[PDB]
């Protein structure tokens, strides 16, 4: 599908495109603390022709480019290169950025993304969590963790 499913779920009035209000409602269903300018940010990037709607191609292009960035952010946390993120890697990656986070705080992050209870975050879990979050790189993700979810991260 996979976007085709998401797109149709978003296109509530079935006119074949997603308007900013429809996207706004979609974000609302995620239960993740995004800013009230999140759909505006997504549209700023995604509505390439500035006609005020996201067609499927624009929607797909937005998500596909976003996914690429999210893979790079995932990779930058995966210090041992096994395709998984564990708590210790969050601690050590932030430390190399000059940020201190305790093991317990890193576990809170892990718990918010880990869906199958492995205490490891895999690409699908990471991607799905971040799919509709406007963040563009690991720093923004960290900004989100501290300033939106309250995780204790000190510089
Ligand atoms: Ca629509
Ligand atoms: Ca808004
Ligand atoms: Ca458009
Ligand atoms: Ca790893
Ligand atoms: Ca997991």
From Swiss-Prot:
Domain topic, free-text comment: The regulatory N-terminal domain/NTD formed of two pairs of fused calcium-binding EF-hands, binds calcium in the mitochondrial intermembrane space and regulates the antiporter activity of the transmembrane domain/TMD. In absence of calcium, the apo form of the N-terminal domain is intrinsically disordered and binds to the transmembrane domain, inhibiting the transporter activity. Binding of calcium leads to a major conformational change and abolishes the interaction with the transmembrane domain and the inhibition of the transporter activity.
Binding locations of Ca(2+) 2: 47, 49, 51, 53, 58
GO annotations of cellular component type: membrane; mitochondrial inner membrane; mitochondrion
List of residues binding Ca(2+) 1: 11, 13, 15, 17, 22
Region of interest called Regulatory N-terminal domain, as start-end residue ranges on this chain: 1-152
Source species of the chain: Homo sapiens
Keyword check for Coiled coil: no
Family: Belongs to the mitochondrial carrier (TC 2.A.29) family.
Ranges where the record places region Linker region: 138-147
Function: Electroneutral antiporter that mediates the transport of adenyl nucleotides through the inner mitochondrial membrane. Originally identified as an ATP-magnesium/inorganic phosphate antiporter, it also acts as a broad specificity adenyl nucleotide antiporter. By regulating the mitochondrial matrix adenyl nucleotide pool could adapt to changing cellular energetic demands and indirectly regulate adenyl nucleotide-dependent metabolic pathways. In vitro, a low activity is also observed with guanyl and pyrimidine nucleotides.
Major location (coarse): mitochondrion
Name of the protein described by the UniProt record: Mitochondrial adenyl nucleotide antiporter SLC25A24
EF-hand domain segment(s): 1-33, 34-67, 65-100, 101-136
Record's subcellular location: Mitochondrion inner membrane
Record-level GO BP terms: adenine nucleotide transport; ADP transport; ATP transport; cellular response to calcium ion; cellular response to oxidative stress; mitochondrial ATP transmembrane transport; mitochondrial transport
Sequence positions that bind Ca(2+) 4: 114, 116, 118, 120, 125
Ligand binding (Ca(2+) 3): 78, 80, 82, 84, 89
Keyword Metal-binding included in the entry's annotation: yes
Subunit-level organization: Monomer.
Disulfide bridge partners, by residue number: none
Key words of the record: Acetylation, Antiport, Calcium, Disease variant, Membrane, Metal-binding, Mitochondrion, Mitochondrion inner membrane, Repeat, Transmembrane, Transmembrane helix, Transport
An example molecular function term from Gene Ontology annotations: calcium ion binding
Disease link: Fontaine progeroid syndrome: An autosomal dominant progeroid disorder characterized by prenatal and postnatal growth retardation, decreased subcutaneous fat tissue, wrinkled skin, an aged appearance since birth, an abnormal scalp hair pattern, sparse hair, hypoplastic distal phalanges with hypoplastic nails, a widely open anterior fontanel, facial dysmorphisms, and craniosynostosis. Early death is observed in some patients.
Entire protein: shown range: 22 to 176 of 477
Tissue: Expressed in all tissues tested. Highly expressed in testis, expressed at intermediate level in small intestine and pancreas, and weakly expressed in kidney, spleen, liver, skeletal muscle and heart.
